[PDB]
């Protein structure tokens, strides 16, 4: 009835913004079981919600690995939602917030990665019968 995920973002300071894209960071936003396991097994598709400002904003993943790379300038919530095999399984959505910019003290190391991920659990209290390929 349980079943384990991480979520959550990446992202890269390029160090110097590129010229006619105003762009700072590449980035790559994701799903993934907490440890290896196909979730495709029981995951029909994960939507990523992204902000109006790029193009093709709703994102849809059917396929592992569930993550969405793409280059930015600033930080914005994220919606995952997570739609199972079986329809009747009500689907698990997800905020997250793209964290591109470090903190002070990571600036002055000169870091020029950043990660903000979370773990989380998929409560399946009654599973559907079918949802037992879990
Ligand atoms: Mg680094």
């Not at 914005?76 to 964290?99: A, G, M, Q, S």
Request: aromatic letters at 14%; proline letters at 6%.
């Amino acid at each position: 009835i349980v079943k384990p995920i991480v979520y959550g973002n990446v992202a890269r300071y390029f160090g110097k913004k590129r010229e006619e894209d105003g762009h700072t960071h590449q980035w790559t936003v994701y799903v993934k079981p907490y440890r290896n396991e196909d979730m495709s097994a029981y995951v029909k598709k994960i939507q990523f919600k992204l902000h109006e400002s790029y193009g093709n904003p709703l994102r849809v993943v059917t396929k592992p690995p569930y993550e969405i790379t793409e280059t930015g300038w600033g930080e914005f919530e994220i919606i995952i939602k997570i739609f199972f095999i079986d329809p009747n399984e009500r689907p698990v959505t997800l905020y997250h917030l793209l964290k591109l910019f470090q903190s002070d003290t990571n600036a002055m190391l000169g870091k020029k990665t950043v990660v903000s991920e979370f773990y989380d659990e998929m409560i399946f209290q009654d599973p559907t019968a079918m949802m037992q390929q879990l």
